[PDB]
C-alpha cells in the first residue's frame, strides 16, 4: 500500500541539448500545478467505474529525461525551499509533501502575482504542529457528533433524520472557521445549508437548547405565528453567540431558513449579510459580517443557480467581501454516482471560472481540516474573493435511515460497511505518542453521554399534548387604521427643485433637459406622469430618514426611457443623483441607493427578498424589464415570498413592479400573469393592486411604509399609460387628498337615476371605455375602477353600486383572456361577499393557449370588437 | 500607435545562479500561457472604465531578467520552432506573431498531451495564404450582409428589425464552418440563436426566400397551423440546403423556433440533435449531426441555463459529439456595461470549468474569422468536445431601431459615430494589394442591389389584404374514434416471462428477488401492482417496434423503489434490462432505454422536449422525483409544451409523470399544483388525467401511443397507492376490456333507487371514502371518480347522475386546500355543461398560503375531519 509509483531502471542519458537545470525547474512547476492528482485525499480504497482518468504523466522523472542516476547530483534550483542548490531528491521530498500527502490544491490559475507567492509561501511551509490542549479540543467535538448520532438513533428508529456519521470532520471544521474570525474582531457568521447533518449543526454550531430538539421528535413543535402551518424539523433557523477557546473574542452566529428546493438559499443568503453589513456602515476597509454556505456535491455541480450567484461577487450593488464555500462530497447523490452526475473532473471546477483557490482535505484526518479551516478564513480577509473547500468522505447509511443502498451499489458498500470511525481512530492515534492517557480518554466518553441522558429524562416527565387545529395567519397583524399620507406643499417644492440644483459644471444631455424641467415646473402648474409620482413617494421616504433601495434591468435610466433616477453629463461622462443629495442634507442620514442588476430573475430576486429580511426599517423594491420573465424567479415567488409567514413566521415588505398591458407587441411582452399571482393568496397573505393614476400609486407605496403591516405588495405597472395626457395628477392630489382609494367611482355621471348598466374595470382600459362614452354621449352607462385587487374591497364596491338604484346590469370588462387576468377570482368570491347584486356578465377575450397573439392588425381588429360588445 | 511596451535601458547582467537558457523556456511557457492579454483583437481602442485590468508583467523581457544585451545571444530551444538553437530576437518575433495579432488563444489548462501538442502545432504554423477566388467569395459575403440592412432601412423605417451592423463578419464565419463540415461528410447542421441578426441569418445562411420576408414587413404572415395566433417574426424557423463552393459536397441546414426569454433554446436544441443522432444508426463512430449555438456576451455570463446545460456533454444519454459555441461580443448590454454584468474577465471563462479551448478573434479582419471557424470545425471533429469563438465587435445603433445610445453611453459613441465599415475596409485593402480590378468591385455591389429590388417591386404589385379574426386550434388534429388498446393473452404471459430469463451466471439481489417472482405469476393469477402496469404499456409498445425513451432523477430504481427496470448483481456488478432484451428477439428492431439523469429540472426537461421534436415517431416521458419541483421547469410548461402549436405550429407528444398526494410528509413533497396546469389548458392543447387503477393507467398510456393526435399528456402518479392492495388489477383488465374509462362509476351500488347523494372524486381518496361507506353500511350514497380532468367528460358524468333519479344533492370531495387542486376549474366549467344538475357543495381543506402542513398529527386531524363532513 505505497501511492507512488516505483522507480524504474535505465540508462544515464548525457547532459546535452536541453540542459538539466531547465529540467528540474519544469518538474518543480508540473508538482505545484498538477500534483492534486495524485494526492492522498480520499478515505476508501475507490475508484468510480466510470468515469475518465486524467492523464498525470507530467509527474514523473522519465517525462523530463531525469533518471535514478540523477538522484545524488545537485542543481540550481533558484529559491525554493529558501535555498540556491539542491539535490533531486530533496527536491522530489520537498514536492511530496506538500502537494502530494493529505492536502491537494489548486491556485496557479490565478493571474495575480502577489496573491500566487502568499498561497505558494504558506502552502511550502507546512502544517505547524498543534500543542496538547488543542489536540484535546478536536477530540472533544469529534466524540459530541458521533454520540449526537447514535442517541438519536437509540431512541427513535424509525424517524428520518439525514445523519452526518461518515463525515463528522465537519464539525470541527465549521468550528475552526468561526474561531479564526472572532479573533480577526469581526461581528457575524451568517450559515445557510441543506439537509446533511443539520440537526447536528444546530446544537453543536450554533447552540440551540437539546431540550428543544428532543421536543421536535416527540411532536411537540415551536410556534413561529400565531395560527400558522409550520414546517419539517430541518428546515428551521436560530441565533447564538460563539466564544473563543484559547482568546478573550466572541462572535455572533445565526442559520436561516429554507425550503427542500436545493440552492435556493444561495441568493437570500448573500441579500441577508449585505443588509447587515450596510446597517453597520463600516466603509470599504470594513465588511465585518461573513457568509458560510455549505452545499452537497451533486446539487453544487448540476442546478445552474450556484454559478449565477457566483457571478455577483465582485459588482457594485452586491459584494459582499467573498463567500467561504464547504463542498461535502461523499461520492453518492441519492442512487446516482458522479459518472451520471457531472462532466467536470472535480464538483468544485466552477472556482476556476472566477480565479479562485480550491483546497481538498481528507475527512479522515482531523488536524488537516482544522488547517485548512484556518487557511481560507485568512485568505479571505486579505483579499476580499471566494474560496473553496472540498471536503471528500463518504455516506455510512443510505439516503435516509429507511432504504438500502446496496441495492444499486454494491461494490461501494463492502468498502464501507465494517470500517472503525473517525473518532476510533483518531483517539487510538493520540495514545499511541503518548498525547493523551486513558483516563482522559474515557471521562471525553462518559461525561457527555451523562449529559444527554439527563436532559432526555427531563423531557419525558413533561406529558404529551394532543394534536389541535391550526386556525390561521389572516387576523395575527394589524392594519393601519386612521393614517394619513399626504405631504405639505412646502415638501412638495423642496422635491421638485432637487432637479435645477445641478452641480457646479455640470450639463443635461439634451433629451433628458425637456424632463428635467417639467419636473420643476410640474410641481406648481400641473400634469405630474407616472415616473414622477412613483420618484416623489421614494423620496418623501428618504427624507424622513430611511434607506430605500430599487434594482433590477435597466432601472436606473427605465426600459421605456421614463425614469431618469441618474443622469450623465455628455462632455465629462460625470453622473448625478438628485434625490440622494437631498435626502443627505436634511440630517436624517437617509439614502436613495439605484442599481442596475445582471440579466437574472432568480437571483435577483432572491437578493432583495434577503435584504428586507436582513433589515426591517428598510424599503426594497425589485423591478422587472417585462412581467412576463418573472416565471424564471418562480422558486422565488412560491417558497419564499408568498408562503414564509405561514410556514416560518418569518415578514417581508418586498415590492415587485411588474409591467403589465396588452397593446400589440406580441404574447412574450404582454402579461404578468395576474392570475397565478391571485391563486397564491389567501388568509391575507399579501397584497395586490393595479392603479391608474400617479396620486394613486403614491399613496400606495406610502401607505405600506409607515404602515406596522409586514407582508409583501404586487403592482402590475403601466407600459403606454406612462405617457397619456387623460392620466396625469395635479399637485392637490398630493397635498390635500389624504388617502389611497380602493374603488374610484365614475367622474362624468350627470345624474345617477338614469344609470341602468354599471361597469366594473381595472387598469388602462378605463381610458378607453371613457372617450367612447363621451363620444357617443351615454347616460345610461357608469364605469367603476377597482384599483386593489386583493384583498377584495366588498364593502365599497357595494356602497358604489348602491348609489345607482336602477341599475339592471353589471357588466366585467377586462383585455385579457377568459382563462386569464382577475375575472377567474372575482367570478369565484365576489357573489357571496354581496348577495343581492345582479348577475355579472363577462366581456373579454376568448380563452387561448398562449398570452396573445403576434400580428398587430388583428390585436386592432380584436379591441374594436371587444369594446362595441361593451356598448351593446 | 504602438501596442507593445518600448525596450528599456539597463546595464548587462551576468550569467550566474539561474542559467539564462532556463530564462528563455520560462518566457516561451508565459507567451503560451497569457499571451492573449495583449492582443489585437478589439476594434475599437477602448478600455471600459470600471473593469479590473489584470497584470501582465509576465510578458515582459525584464521580469525574466533578461535585457537589449541578450537579443543578438543565442540559445537552446529544444525544438520550438523546428529548431534546436535561436536568438532571442527571433524567438520574440515567433511568440508575437502566433500569441498577439488578431487571434488570442487559451488552450495550456487542457489535461491532455495529445490535444495541446495538436493545437500548439497548428497555432504557431500560423494562417495559410488564401487564393484569389476565396477572397472575392468572402466579399460576396459580406457585402450581402451590410446590403441587406441597408434596405431594410429605407424602405421600413419605424420597424423593429434588431441590425446586425457592426458584426456583419458572422455570416463568413458561419459559412466557414457550415463548408468545412460537409467536406467531412456529415449529414445536417442544426442552429439556435437569439434576435440579434436573425433575418440575415435566415436569408444568407438557411436560404429563406427574400419574398417571404418582404410579405412579413408588409403585414401578411405565414400560419403554421388551421386557427393559430402566431409570433413575432424573429421568432421563427426554417430548413434549407449548403452546396460547396469549392467541392462537390452537400449539407442541410436547418434553424429552430424560441420564445423572447434568453437562453431556453440551448437544451432544446441539444434533445434535437440527439435524436436525429439516434434515428441515424452510426454507432460511437458516427455523430453526424453538428449542433451550432450562437450566445450574446451579456445573456452568457449572466444566466444560469448556460453551464447546466455545458454540464450534459460527456453523460451517457446526453452526448452529442460536442457542440460548436459563437458569442457576438459587442460590449454592451441593453443600456449596462460589461462592469455591471459579469465578474469574470471574459464571458467565455466557463469554458476554463470544462477544460475546453477558447478562440478570441478580431471582427475587423475577415480572413482570420474563416480560418477560426474552420479550426474550430475540425477540433470537434477529432477530439468529440465543445469549442468556444468569442468574436469581438460593437453595437451601431441602439438596442432597437427607436433607441438612443448616446443618453447613457456618451464616451463610447464617440469612437463608433462615423467609422467605415468592415466591408469598405476590406475592398479598399484588397484592391491595394492588386487582388481585385475595380471593374469587378463595382459589379458586386450592383448585381445585389438589382436582385433586390426586383422581388420587392414583385411583391408590391399584389394587393394587401385585411386583417380576419383568429379562429382557434380545438378541431385542427382529430380525435381515434373506436380505437382498441387492449393485447392478447400470449403477449402478456411473454412480458411476464421476460423477469425469469437471466442472463447465464446472473442473480438477482435478496431484496428485488421476491419482486420479480411475483411479476412472473401476476400474469396470471393477479395482483398487478401500478409500477408493473406502466412497464408492461412501455413494453408492448417497444415490442411492436418503436423506440421507447425514460428519463429523471433515479429513474431506473425510482424514487420509492418500485420500477426496476434494471437490475444489478450483487457478486459481479453486471446489469439486465428485461424489456429490452425481449424487444430485441422480436425483429422489429425496438428498443427500451432508461436513463439517470443530472439534478436538473429545467435542462431535463427541455431536453425531453427537443427529442420529441426531433423523432416524431418516438415515445418519451419524462419523469421527476416529486411534482413540488417541477417549478424550476417552468419556463418550459410555459413557452413550449403548454403553447407552442398555438404560436409556430411546432407539436409534440411528450408525456409528465408528476407524483402527487396529501399524505403528511410536508409542504414540499405533497402537491404537483393541479390547479396551475388547468390554467393553462384552453382550446384543447394537452391532456391531464389523474388514474385510479393499472389496468387504466395501461389504457391511457397505448391510446396516446397509437393514436394521431400529436399534443402532451400530463399525468398525476401516486406514492402511497403504489402498495396499496384494493388498488390492484386482474389480467382479464388487460386483454378483454378494451378502452380506457373516463369516469367509473361505483361498484358497490345494491338499489340505485334508494340513493340520495353523489359524491364526485379523483385520485386516492376514493379508497377511504370506499372504505368508510362500508364499515358504516351506508346505501344513501353512490361514489363517482373522474379519471379525465381537461378535457371535461360531461356527457359521461351527466349519464353517470341520471342513472340516479332520486338524488338531491351533488357533493365535490378533494383533499387539497379551496383554492388548490381542481374544484376552482370544476365550479366554473361544469354548470354550464350540465344545465340540469343540482348545486354543488365542495368538501375539502381550508384555503391556505401553503401547500400543507408541516406537523403530522395535525394531518390526521385534517383528515379525519374532512371524511366526517362528507358523511353528514
Ligand atoms: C391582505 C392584508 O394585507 S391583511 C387583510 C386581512 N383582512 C381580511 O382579509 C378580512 C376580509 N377582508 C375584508 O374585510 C376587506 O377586504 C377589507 C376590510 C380588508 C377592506 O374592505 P373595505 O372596507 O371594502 O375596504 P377599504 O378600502 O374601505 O379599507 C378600510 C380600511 O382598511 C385599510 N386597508 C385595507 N386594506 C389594506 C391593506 N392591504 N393595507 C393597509 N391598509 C389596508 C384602509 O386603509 C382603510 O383604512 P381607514 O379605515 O383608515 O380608511
Ligand atoms: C384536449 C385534446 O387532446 S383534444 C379535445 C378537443 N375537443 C374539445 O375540447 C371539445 C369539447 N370537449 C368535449 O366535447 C368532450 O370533453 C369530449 C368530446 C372530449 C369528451 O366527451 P365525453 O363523451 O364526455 O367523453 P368520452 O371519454 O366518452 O369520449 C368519447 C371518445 O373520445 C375519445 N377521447 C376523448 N378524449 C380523448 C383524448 N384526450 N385523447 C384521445 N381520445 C380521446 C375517447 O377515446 C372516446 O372514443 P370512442 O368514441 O371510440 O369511445
Ligand atoms: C431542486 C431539487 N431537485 C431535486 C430534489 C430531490 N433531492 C433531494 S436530495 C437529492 C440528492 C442530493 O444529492 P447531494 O447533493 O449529493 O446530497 P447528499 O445526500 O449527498 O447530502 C435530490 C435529487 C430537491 N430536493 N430539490
Ligand atoms: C430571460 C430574459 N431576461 C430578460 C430579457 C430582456 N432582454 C432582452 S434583450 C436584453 C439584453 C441582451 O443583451 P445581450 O445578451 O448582450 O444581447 P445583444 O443586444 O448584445 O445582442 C435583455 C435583458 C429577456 N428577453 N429574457
Ligand atoms: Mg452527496
Ligand atoms: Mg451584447
Known amino acids: 500500500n505505497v501511492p507512488y509509483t516505483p522507480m524504474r531502471w535505465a540508462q544515464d542519458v548525457p547532459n546535452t541539448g536541453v540542459d538539466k537545470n531547465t529540467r528540474v525547474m519544469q518538474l518543480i512547476e508540473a508538482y505545484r500545478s498538477r500534483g492534486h492528482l495524485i494526492a492522498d485525499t480520499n478515505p476508501l480504497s475507490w475508484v468510480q467505474p466510470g468515469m475518465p482518468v486524467p492523464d498525470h504523466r507530467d509527474l514523473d522523472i522519465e517525462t523530463h529525461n531525469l533518471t535514478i542516476w540523477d538522484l545524488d547530483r545537485t542543481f540550481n534550483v533558484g529559491g525554493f525551499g529558501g535555498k540556491e542548490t539542491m539535490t533531486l531528491r530533496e527536491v522530489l521530498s520537498r514536492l511530496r509533501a506538500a502537494y502530494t500527502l493529505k492536502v491537494g490544491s489548486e491556485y496557479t490559475h490565478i493571474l495575480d502575482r502577489d496573491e500566487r507567492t502568499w498561497l505558494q509561501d504558506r502552502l511550502e511551509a507546512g502544517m505547524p504542529k498543534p500543542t496538547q490542549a488543542e489536540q484535546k479540543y478536536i477530540l472533544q467535538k469529534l466524540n459530541a457528533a458521533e454520540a449526537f448520532e447514535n442517541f438519536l438513533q437509540t431512541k427513535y428508529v424509525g424517524q428520518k433524520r439525514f445523519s452526518l456519521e461518515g463525515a463528522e470532520a465537519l464539525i470541527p471544521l465549521m468550528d475552526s472557521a468561526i474561531d479564526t474570525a472572532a479573533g480577526q474582531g469581526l461581528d457575524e457568521v451568517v450559515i445557510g445549508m441543506p439537509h446533511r447533518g443539520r440537526l447536528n449543526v444546530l446544537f453543536n454550531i450554533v447552540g440551540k437548547p437539546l431540550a428543544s430538539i428532543f421536543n421536535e421528535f416527540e411532536g411537540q413543535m415551536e410556534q413561529g405565528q400565531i395560527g400558522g402551518s409550520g414546517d419539517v424539523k430541518y428546515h428551521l433557523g436560530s441565533e447564538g453567540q460563539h466564544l473563543q477557546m484559547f482568546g478573550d473574542g466572541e462572535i455572533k452566529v445565526s442559520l436561516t431558513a429554507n425550503p427542500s428546493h436545493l440552492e435556493a438559499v444561495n441568493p437570500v443568503m448573500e441579500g441577508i449579510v449585505r443588509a447587515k453589513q450596510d446597517y453597520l456602515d463600516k466603509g470599504v476597509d470594513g465588511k465585518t459580517v461573513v457568509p458560510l454556505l455549505l452545499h452537497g456535491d451533486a446539487a453544487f455541480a448540476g442546478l445552474g443557480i450556484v454559478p449565477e450567484t457566483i457571478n455577483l461577487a465582485k459588482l457594485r450593488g452586491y ?20 459518472d451520471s452526475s457531472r462532466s467536470m473532473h472535480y464538483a468544485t471546477d466552477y472556482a476556476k471560472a472566477f480565479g479562485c483557490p480550491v483546497f481538498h482535505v481528507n475527512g479522515d484526518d482531523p488536524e488537516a481540516v482544522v488547517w485548512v479551516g484556518q487557511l481560507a478564513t485568512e485568505y479571505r480577509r486579505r483579499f476580499g474573493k471566494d474560496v473553496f473547500i472540498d471536503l471528500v468522505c463518504y455516506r455510512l447509511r443510505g439516503h435516509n435511515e429507511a432504504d438500502d443502498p446496496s441495492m444499486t451499489q454494491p461494490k461501494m458498500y463492502e468498502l464501507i460497511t465494517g470500517r472503525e470511525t473517525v473518532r476510533a481512530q483518531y483517539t487510538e492515534d493520540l495514545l499511541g505518542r503518548g498525547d493523551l492517557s486513558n483516563e482522559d480518554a474515557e471521562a471525553v466518553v462518559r ?42 406643499r412646502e415638501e412638495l417644492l423642496e422635491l421638485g427643485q432637487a432637479f435645477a440644483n445641478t452641480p457646479e459644471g455640470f450639463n443635461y444631455h439634451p433629451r433628458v433637459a425637456p424632463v428635467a424641467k417639467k419636473r420643476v415646473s410640474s410641481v406648481t402648474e400641473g400634469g405630474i406622469d407616472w415616473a414622477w409620482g412613483e420618484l416623489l413617494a421614494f423620496g418623501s421616504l428618504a427624507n424622513s430618514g430611511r434607506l430605500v433601495r430599487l434594482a433590477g434591468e435597466d432601472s436606473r435610466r427605465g426600459t421605456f426611457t421614463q425614469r431618469h433616477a441618474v443622469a450623465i453629463d455628455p462632455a465629462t461622462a460625470e453622473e448625478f443623483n438628485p434625490l440622494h443629495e437631498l435626502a443627505q442634507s436634511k440630517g436624517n442620514n437617509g439614502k436613495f441607493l439605484v442599481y442596475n442588476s445582471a440579466l437574472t430573475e432568480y437571483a435577483g430576486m432572491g437578493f432583495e427578498y434577503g435584504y428586507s429580511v436582513g433589515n426591517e426599517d428598510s424599503i426594497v423594491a425589485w423591478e422587472a424589464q417585462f412581467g412576463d420573465f418573472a416565471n424564471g424567479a418562480q422558486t422565488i415567488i412560491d417558497e419564499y415570498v408568498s408562503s414564509g409567514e405561514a410556514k416560518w413566521g418569518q415578514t417581508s415588505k418586498l415590492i415587485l413592479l411588474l409591467p403589465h398591458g396588452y397593446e400589440g407587441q406580441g404574447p412574450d411582452h404582454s402579461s404578468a400573469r395576474i392570475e397565478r399571482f391571485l391563486q397564491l393568496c389567501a388568509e391575507g397573505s399579501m397584497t ?62 350627470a345624474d345617477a337615476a338614469k344609470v341602468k348598466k354599471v361597469m366594473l374595470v ?30 377584495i374591497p366588498f364593502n365599497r364596491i357595494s356602497e358604489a353600486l348602491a348609489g345607482y338604484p336602477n341599475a339592471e346590469e353589471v357588466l366585467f370588462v377586462q383585455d ?5 387576468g382577475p375575472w377567474p377570482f372575482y367570478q369565484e368570491h365576489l357573489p357571496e361577499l354581496i348577495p343581492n347584486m345582479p348577475k355579472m356578465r363577462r366581456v373579454s377575450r376568448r380563452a387561448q393557449s398562449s398570452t396573445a397573439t403576434g400580428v398587430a392588425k388583428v390585436h386592432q381588429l380584436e379591441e374594436k370588437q371587444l369594446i362595441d360588445e361593451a356598448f351593446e
Chains 1, 2 share one sequence.
Not at 404529551?464 to 392594519?479: C, M, R, V
Not at 403606454?720 to 387623460?726: D, F, P, T, V, Y
Not at 364605469?783 to 386593489?788: D, H, K, L, P
Not at 385579457?816 to 386569464?820: L, R
Open 688 to 749: 395586490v393592486a393595479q392603479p391608474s393614476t400617479p396620486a394613486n400609486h403614491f399613496h400606495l407605496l406610502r401607505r405600506h411604509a409607515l404602515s406596522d403591516l409586514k407582508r409583501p405588495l404586487v403592482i402590475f405597472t403601466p407600459k403606454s399609460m406612462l405617457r397619456n395626457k387623460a392620466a396625469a395628477s395635479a399637485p392637490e392630489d398630493f397635498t390635500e387628498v389624504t388617502k389611497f382609494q380602493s374603488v374610484i367611482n365614475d367622474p362624468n355621471v
Open 816 to 820: 385579457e383572456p377568459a382563462n386569464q
Open 762 to 791: 381595472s387598469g388602462k382600459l378605463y381610458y378607453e371605455l371613457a372617450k367612447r362614452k363621451e363620444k357617443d354621449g351615454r347616460d345610461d352607462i357608469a364605469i367603476v375602477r377597482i384599483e386593489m385587487l386583493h384583498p
Open 447 to 488: 461525561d457527555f453521554h451523562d449529559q444527554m441522558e439527563s436532559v432526555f429524562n427531563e423531557v419525558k416527565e413533561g406529558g404529551k399534548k394532543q394534536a389541535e387545529a391550526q386556525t390561521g395567519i389572516t387576523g395575527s397583524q394589524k392594519l393601519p387604521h386612521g393614517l394619513e399620507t399626504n405631504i405639505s
Open 319 to 338: 459584494d459582499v467581501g467573498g463567500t467561504i464555500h464547504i463542498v461535502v462530497n461523499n461520492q453518492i447523490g441519492f442512487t446516482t454516482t458522479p
